[PDB]
Amino acid sequence: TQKMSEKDTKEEILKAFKLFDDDETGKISFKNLKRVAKELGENLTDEELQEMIDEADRDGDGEVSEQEFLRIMKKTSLY
């Protein structure tokens, strides 16, 4: 069945990544994550910011580059 014919989830994810990455550093850090949390205005308790980064790869990168963010998004590949 046809749904998304476009490729531009990569564009979405890239421009989303840049809305976290203020620093233009190529990483979403904990700080960038919490800076996003206070931009939405959601009163998160630091530990779930830690969970979100810990989820998005302490195995290889440590904090979150675009491939880790792509991995965290592509986790929903019908899931």
């Binding site: 994810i13 996003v36 949390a37």
Partner: peptide, 20 residues
């Protein structure tokens, strides 16, 4: 649900898809 007048919101889509 980010339907009418997309001034901002859609950082929510990125953040909330990660946390929730």
């Amino acid at each position: 649900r980010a339907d009418l007048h997309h001034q901002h919101s859609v950082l929510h889509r990125a953040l909330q898809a990660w946390v929730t």
